[PDB]
Amino acid sequence: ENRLESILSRFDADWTASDEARREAKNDLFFSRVSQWDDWLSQYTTLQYRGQFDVVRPVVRKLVSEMRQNPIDVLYRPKDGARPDAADVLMGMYRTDMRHNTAKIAVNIAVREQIEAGVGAWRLVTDYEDQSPTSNNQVIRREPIHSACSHVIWDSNSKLMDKSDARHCTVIHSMSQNGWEDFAEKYDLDADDIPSFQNPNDWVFPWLTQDTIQIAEFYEVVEKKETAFIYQDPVTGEPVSYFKRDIKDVIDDLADSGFIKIAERQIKRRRVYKSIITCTAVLKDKQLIAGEHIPIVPVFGEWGFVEDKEVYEGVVRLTKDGQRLRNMIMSFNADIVARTPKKKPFFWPEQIAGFEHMYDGNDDYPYYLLNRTDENSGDLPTQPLAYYENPEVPQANAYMLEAATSAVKEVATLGVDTEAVNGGQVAFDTVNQLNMRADLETYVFQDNLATAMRRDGEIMAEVVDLATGEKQVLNDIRGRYECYTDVGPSFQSMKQQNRAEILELLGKTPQGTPEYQLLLLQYFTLLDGKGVEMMRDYANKQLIQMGVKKPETPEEQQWLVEAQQAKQG
Amino acid sequence: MRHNTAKIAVNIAVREQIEAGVGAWRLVTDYEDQSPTSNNQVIRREPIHS
Amino acid sequence: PVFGEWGFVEDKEVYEGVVRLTKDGQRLRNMIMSFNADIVARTPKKKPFFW
Amino acid sequence: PVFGEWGFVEDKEVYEGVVRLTKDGQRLRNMIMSFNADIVARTPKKKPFFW
Amino acid sequence: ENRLESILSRFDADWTASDEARREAKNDLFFSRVSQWDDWLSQYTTLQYRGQFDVVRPVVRKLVSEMRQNPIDVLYRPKDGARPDAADVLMGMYRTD
Amino acid sequence: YMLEAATSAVKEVATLGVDTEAVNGGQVAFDTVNQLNMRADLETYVFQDN
Amino acid sequence: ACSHVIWDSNSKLMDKSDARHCTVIHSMSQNGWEDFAEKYDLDADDIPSF
């Protein structure tokens, strides 16, 4: 039907999608409990003992500790056609705004939820930095998303793991009063409005958190096929460069008074839009956000479809059933030990009567006395043959305890292999690096928007390789995507990687000649010191006089001068 | 076949291969203006659940 | 299309993964297991009989 | 601030050290242990019954 | 609402935050007990024996001893652009205090 | 029974997945969450000499 | 620290870097309060609370 009421559209695409963020989410957030909160559920005040003797944690702890020692980040290799020095520019930028704690933390948060619940996710954001910005007075940042199973929801009928074929991805925020005030501050809103939403949490309510305050960011995407605008490069010839009309609106005047040229073409290109939403109404519609992808990568454990219903899980889910038995039986046994008569003798009051004194616990007497006779008969004090039987813990409890716990650690494994080989969680690391990739298709496709700012024109009486500075605040040619994305060990900085890259090149090479160059190059890369400086400089001079270095020329020019003499003496 | 989809689609298939016995994916094509494989077009491997 | 174990029988196509054979025994495991859980849950504890 | 195991649940912050999980079983140990001590302390020794 | 009474603002941001320094803090400081003070809780004068035969301590002791022999501090590397001798100045200062 | 059971149940979870001596500390995940704070100790220290 | 530094600014991460409060608490002896009121210059006869 036709009903372009915007909120009715957006809300009637969340509502429709939250019918899956039901069947699954219901389970998923429930695992973030048999591990995160407590292994018992839905009573919260009973009179009978309930112990918690889990065995799932240690497994989880193990798995985390493994993924936490194999960092895995992005790579960006060039491409089959492009020039070798294509990646370094981008990579340097990426490495730069992913150094901070947040970038690290956000991922760790995701993988933990990946392991426990089955999902996890983080978002990419941008904003301005005046001091120490990555590029163009701006910086990109990786932000955390807790409880991804119940906050990010995107049934766009998306049929794959990085949710790249999705078009929605509506996420939810819960925030404190002060947080809402500060939020209404940033995005400029009525702080006295107070928002609402499906409420990612739950209905159970035996706690002290009542400040709901949930607002919702709604992302959407459209492959628009926007338009044209080509030009000729005034610099050293080699003309023909293309630009987005949308992105150079107010600029073309200035763009013309510098190298105006002409031609047109229709280019297909995706655009994303973040809209703020409450149940009642929309507070910010169609606000255009940076890149050309929805800035939210999701990690998955075991994932797939069933009845055309999305499905996923972490390690924890299978264990739940047996683990509860363990806890129950265990608690039952505790009752058996606590409330239960101890072994003591049965007496007729009559036989003990007269000297119950002797049976209290004294080691004062040499023996025990018993009344023998009784008028009206000859008493039958058959020496006390009867004691109350000891507490025993039924065979069934014993059996079912051992059974359950075994049954648990049977599935508390992902096919884990020997130490140092074939991680018990390759399949988790891979499904993670898959998301690390979606973290570039998202990052790459977003410098070309914000950070931006690169170009490298080719062409004594000859030269080549010369950078640029562009014009105005944004100005990237449409010949962008020259590097494809790949994953590899995480490094703090480009220099870190280059250093490691050379160490690898060593050992895998003989003590021949090319060893020495690598060896020297290593010293060359070392950072400040008293020890390293002397050696780094020596290695430099060495490499320049080797002729292979080719002077950076801050002074190394003269280093070559006394080298040019060539056995001149 | 570098993109995630090409990878994912196969992994999806093999999992169903192991569990159920079958699995499958499809190849599709369409136009790409920026960064196309060739002739303003690109081929892609799509998933087929169940 | 990928196939695990595949072939024809009565001129009828046929195929299966690892899972199919396990189903029968695995259900028994679950049942017996559940039965036992009942045994532990609902069942009088050991106590004395008195007049 | 340093954290051991940390994360969010019902949009409620959550965290714990190694100690938390152990608490339940450790108390049982101490109790049963104490119970037994009583058994050894207060309890009639083996002696004969005589008229 | 508008109520720029400073203390009412600061106090009404602590009070609001101490509702989490509740559910969790309640537990957290309680562990600094089954280990730090004593493994029994909330009676403190009974007539019946209460032994303390823990096994948690040894684990904790072990964990501490491990982290105590892998010091871990700061580094301050320069940067992709900066000159190599960038860090030493700061580092020297950090190391110092 | 319940004594042996309890104490075992305790040392079951009195471990962070601890590995062999000299390799993979039974507390890498603790050391890391610490070095994370060691980093916040600079963003705090660097941004305070200035 | 579990009961002295408290900072729900709705801070959603581990180094609490996105926080804006972080109110900490001091417990101190009489002589400590006198010496504290000395440093930060305060009425030693006030006696605080929290």
Short mmCIF file of all heavy atoms in Angstrom, two decimals, chain A residues 482-514:
data_model
loop_
_atom_site.label_atom_id
_atom_site.label_comp_id
_atom_site.label_asym_id
_atom_site.label_seq_id
_atom_site.Cartn_x
_atom_site.Cartn_y
_atom_site.Cartn_z
N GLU A 482 41.85 1.27 -4.71
CA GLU A 482 43.01 0.72 -5.39
C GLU A 482 43.63 -0.39 -4.54
O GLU A 482 44.46 -1.16 -5.01
CB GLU A 482 44.04 1.82 -5.65
CG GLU A 482 45.00 1.54 -6.80
CD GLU A 482 44.33 1.52 -8.16
OE1 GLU A 482 43.12 1.83 -8.24
OE2 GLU A 482 45.01 1.20 -9.16
N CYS A 483 43.20 -0.45 -3.28
CA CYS A 483 43.65 -1.48 -2.34
C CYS A 483 42.48 -2.38 -1.93
O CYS A 483 41.40 -1.89 -1.62
CB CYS A 483 44.25 -0.84 -1.08
SG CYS A 483 45.70 0.19 -1.38
N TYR A 484 42.70 -3.69 -1.94
CA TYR A 484 41.71 -4.60 -1.39
C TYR A 484 42.03 -4.92 0.06
O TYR A 484 43.18 -4.80 0.48
CB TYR A 484 41.62 -5.88 -2.21
CG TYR A 484 42.78 -6.83 -2.03
CD1 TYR A 484 42.82 -7.70 -0.95
CD2 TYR A 484 43.83 -6.86 -2.94
CE1 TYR A 484 43.87 -8.58 -0.79
CE2 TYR A 484 44.88 -7.74 -2.78
CZ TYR A 484 44.90 -8.60 -1.70
OH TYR A 484 45.95 -9.48 -1.54
N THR A 485 41.02 -5.32 0.82
CA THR A 485 41.18 -5.53 2.26
C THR A 485 41.50 -6.98 2.63
O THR A 485 40.93 -7.92 2.08
CB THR A 485 39.93 -5.07 3.03
OG1 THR A 485 39.32 -6.21 3.66
CG2 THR A 485 38.93 -4.42 2.09
N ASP A 486 42.42 -7.15 3.57
CA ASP A 486 42.79 -8.47 4.04
C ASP A 486 43.11 -8.36 5.52
O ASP A 486 43.21 -7.26 6.05
CB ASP A 486 44.00 -8.99 3.26
CG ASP A 486 44.24 -10.48 3.48
OD1 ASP A 486 43.30 -11.17 3.90
OD2 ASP A 486 45.38 -10.95 3.23
N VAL A 487 43.24 -9.50 6.19
CA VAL A 487 43.53 -9.51 7.63
C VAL A 487 44.92 -10.03 7.94
O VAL A 487 45.54 -10.73 7.13
CB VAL A 487 42.53 -10.39 8.39
CG1 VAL A 487 41.17 -9.71 8.46
CG2 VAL A 487 42.46 -11.75 7.74
N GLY A 488 45.41 -9.69 9.13
CA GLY A 488 46.73 -10.10 9.55
C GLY A 488 46.98 -9.60 10.95
O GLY A 488 46.18 -8.85 11.49
N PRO A 489 48.10 -10.02 11.55
CA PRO A 489 48.45 -9.65 12.92
C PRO A 489 48.28 -8.15 13.16
O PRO A 489 48.59 -7.35 12.28
CB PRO A 489 49.92 -10.03 13.01
CG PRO A 489 50.04 -11.20 12.09
CD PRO A 489 49.10 -10.92 10.95
N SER A 490 47.80 -7.80 14.35
CA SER A 490 47.63 -6.41 14.72
C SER A 490 48.95 -5.77 15.12
O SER A 490 49.72 -6.37 15.87
CB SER A 490 46.62 -6.28 15.86
OG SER A 490 46.54 -4.95 16.35
N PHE A 491 49.19 -4.56 14.63
CA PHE A 491 50.37 -3.80 15.04
C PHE A 491 49.98 -2.41 15.50
O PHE A 491 48.95 -1.87 15.08
CB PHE A 491 51.38 -3.70 13.90
CG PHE A 491 51.93 -5.01 13.45
CD1 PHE A 491 51.47 -5.62 12.29
CD2 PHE A 491 52.93 -5.64 14.18
CE1 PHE A 491 51.98 -6.83 11.87
CE2 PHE A 491 53.44 -6.85 13.77
CZ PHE A 491 52.97 -7.45 12.61
N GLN A 492 50.80 -1.84 16.37
CA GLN A 492 50.53 -0.52 16.93
C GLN A 492 50.72 0.60 15.89
O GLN A 492 50.08 1.64 15.97
CB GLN A 492 51.42 -0.26 18.15
CG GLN A 492 50.92 -0.88 19.44
CD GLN A 492 49.76 -0.10 20.04
OE1 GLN A 492 48.93 0.45 19.32
NE2 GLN A 492 49.71 -0.05 21.37
N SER A 493 51.60 0.37 14.93
CA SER A 493 51.95 1.40 13.97
C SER A 493 52.65 0.81 12.76
O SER A 493 53.12 -0.32 12.80
CB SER A 493 52.88 2.42 14.63
OG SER A 493 54.11 1.82 15.00
N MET A 494 52.71 1.58 11.68
CA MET A 494 53.34 1.11 10.46
C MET A 494 54.79 0.67 10.72
O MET A 494 55.26 -0.33 10.17
CB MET A 494 53.29 2.19 9.37
CG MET A 494 53.40 1.65 7.96
SD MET A 494 52.02 0.32 7.61
CE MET A 494 50.53 1.26 8.42
N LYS A 495 55.49 1.42 11.56
CA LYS A 495 56.89 1.13 11.85
C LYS A 495 57.01 -0.20 12.58
O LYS A 495 57.96 -0.95 12.37
CB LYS A 495 57.53 2.25 12.68
CG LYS A 495 59.05 2.20 12.72
CD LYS A 495 59.63 3.47 13.31
CE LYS A 495 59.28 4.71 12.48
NZ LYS A 495 59.87 5.97 13.03
N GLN A 496 56.02 -0.50 13.42
CA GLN A 496 55.98 -1.77 14.13
C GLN A 496 55.94 -2.92 13.12
O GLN A 496 56.74 -3.85 13.19
CB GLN A 496 54.75 -1.82 15.03
CG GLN A 496 54.81 -2.86 16.14
CD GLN A 496 55.38 -2.30 17.43
OE1 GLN A 496 54.65 -1.73 18.25
NE2 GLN A 496 56.69 -2.45 17.61
N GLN A 497 55.02 -2.82 12.17
CA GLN A 497 54.83 -3.87 11.17
C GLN A 497 56.07 -4.04 10.30
O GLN A 497 56.53 -5.16 10.07
CB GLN A 497 53.61 -3.58 10.29
CG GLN A 497 53.55 -4.45 9.04
CD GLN A 497 52.47 -4.02 8.08
OE1 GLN A 497 51.58 -3.24 8.43
NE2 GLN A 497 52.54 -4.51 6.84
N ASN A 498 56.62 -2.93 9.82
CA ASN A 498 57.80 -2.99 8.98
C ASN A 498 58.94 -3.67 9.71
O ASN A 498 59.71 -4.43 9.12
CB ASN A 498 58.21 -1.59 8.50
CG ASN A 498 57.17 -0.96 7.58
OD1 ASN A 498 56.47 -1.65 6.85
ND2 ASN A 498 57.08 0.37 7.63
N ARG A 499 59.04 -3.40 11.01
CA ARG A 499 60.09 -4.00 11.82
C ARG A 499 59.91 -5.51 11.88
O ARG A 499 60.86 -6.26 11.67
CB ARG A 499 60.09 -3.40 13.23
CG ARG A 499 61.32 -3.75 14.06
CD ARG A 499 61.29 -3.05 15.42
NE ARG A 499 61.14 -1.60 15.28
CZ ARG A 499 60.20 -0.88 15.90
NH1 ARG A 499 59.34 -1.48 16.71
NH2 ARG A 499 60.13 0.43 15.72
N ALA A 500 58.68 -5.94 12.17
CA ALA A 500 58.38 -7.37 12.24
C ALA A 500 58.52 -8.04 10.87
O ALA A 500 58.97 -9.18 10.77
CB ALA A 500 56.99 -7.58 12.78
N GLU A 501 58.13 -7.32 9.83
CA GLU A 501 58.16 -7.85 8.48
C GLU A 501 59.58 -8.23 8.08
O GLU A 501 59.78 -9.19 7.34
CB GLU A 501 57.58 -6.84 7.48
CG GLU A 501 57.17 -7.44 6.14
CD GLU A 501 56.25 -6.53 5.34
OE1 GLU A 501 55.84 -5.48 5.88
OE2 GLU A 501 55.93 -6.86 4.18
N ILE A 502 60.55 -7.48 8.59
CA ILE A 502 61.96 -7.74 8.27
C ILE A 502 62.53 -8.88 9.11
O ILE A 502 63.33 -9.69 8.61
CB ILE A 502 62.81 -6.48 8.46
CG1 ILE A 502 62.31 -5.37 7.54
CG2 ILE A 502 64.26 -6.78 8.17
CD1 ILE A 502 62.96 -4.04 7.80
N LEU A 503 62.13 -8.95 10.37
CA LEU A 503 62.57 -10.04 11.22
C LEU A 503 62.13 -11.37 10.63
O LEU A 503 62.87 -12.36 10.68
CB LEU A 503 62.00 -9.87 12.63
CG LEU A 503 62.64 -8.78 13.49
CD1 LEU A 503 61.82 -8.55 14.75
CD2 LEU A 503 64.07 -9.13 13.85
N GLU A 504 60.93 -11.39 10.07
CA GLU A 504 60.44 -12.58 9.38
C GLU A 504 61.34 -12.90 8.19
O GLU A 504 61.67 -14.06 7.96
CB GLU A 504 59.00 -12.38 8.90
CG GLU A 504 58.45 -13.55 8.08
CD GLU A 504 57.05 -13.29 7.53
OE1 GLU A 504 56.26 -12.61 8.22
OE2 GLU A 504 56.75 -13.77 6.42
N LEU A 505 61.74 -11.87 7.45
CA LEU A 505 62.61 -12.04 6.29
C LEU A 505 63.96 -12.61 6.67
O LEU A 505 64.64 -13.23 5.85
CB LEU A 505 62.78 -10.71 5.54
CG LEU A 505 61.81 -10.45 4.39
CD1 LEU A 505 62.05 -11.41 3.24
CD2 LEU A 505 60.36 -10.53 4.86
N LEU A 506 64.36 -12.39 7.92
CA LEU A 506 65.56 -13.01 8.45
C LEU A 506 65.26 -14.43 8.91
O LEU A 506 64.10 -14.79 9.13
CB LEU A 506 66.12 -12.18 9.61
CG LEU A 506 66.68 -10.81 9.23
CD1 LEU A 506 67.20 -10.08 10.45
CD2 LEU A 506 67.79 -10.98 8.21
N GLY A 507 66.31 -15.24 9.07
CA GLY A 507 66.14 -16.62 9.47
C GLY A 507 65.66 -17.47 8.31
O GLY A 507 66.18 -18.56 8.07
N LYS A 508 64.67 -16.97 7.59
CA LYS A 508 64.18 -17.63 6.39
C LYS A 508 65.12 -17.34 5.22
O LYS A 508 64.81 -17.64 4.07
CB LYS A 508 62.75 -17.21 6.07
CG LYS A 508 62.59 -15.75 5.69
CD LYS A 508 62.60 -15.55 4.18
CE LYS A 508 61.38 -16.20 3.53
NZ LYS A 508 61.32 -15.93 2.07
N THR A 509 66.27 -16.75 5.53
CA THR A 509 67.29 -16.49 4.53
C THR A 509 68.68 -16.84 5.06
O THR A 509 68.97 -16.63 6.24
CB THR A 509 67.28 -15.02 4.08
OG1 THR A 509 67.25 -14.18 5.23
CG2 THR A 509 66.05 -14.75 3.23
N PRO A 510 69.54 -17.38 4.18
CA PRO A 510 70.89 -17.84 4.53
C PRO A 510 71.79 -16.71 5.05
O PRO A 510 71.41 -15.55 4.98
CB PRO A 510 71.43 -18.37 3.20
CG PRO A 510 70.21 -18.70 2.39
CD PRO A 510 69.21 -17.66 2.77
N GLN A 511 72.96 -17.07 5.56
CA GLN A 511 73.94 -16.10 6.02
C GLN A 511 74.67 -15.46 4.84
O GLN A 511 75.75 -14.90 4.99
CB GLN A 511 74.96 -16.75 6.96
CG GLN A 511 74.33 -17.64 8.02
CD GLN A 511 73.35 -16.91 8.90
OE1 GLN A 511 73.33 -15.68 8.92
NE2 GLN A 511 72.53 -17.66 9.64
N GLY A 512 74.07 -15.57 3.65
CA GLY A 512 74.62 -14.99 2.44
C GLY A 512 74.65 -13.48 2.51
O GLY A 512 74.68 -12.89 3.59
N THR A 513 74.64 -12.84 1.35
CA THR A 513 74.71 -11.38 1.30
C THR A 513 73.38 -10.67 1.62
O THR A 513 73.37 -9.75 2.44
CB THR A 513 75.31 -10.87 -0.04
OG1 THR A 513 74.81 -9.56 -0.32
CG2 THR A 513 74.97 -11.80 -1.20
N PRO A 514 72.26 -11.09 1.00
CA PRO A 514 71.01 -10.36 1.26
C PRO A 514 70.62 -10.38 2.74
O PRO A 514 69.77 -9.58 3.14
CB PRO A 514 69.98 -11.13 0.42
CG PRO A 514 70.78 -11.80 -0.65
CD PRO A 514 72.07 -12.18 0.03
#
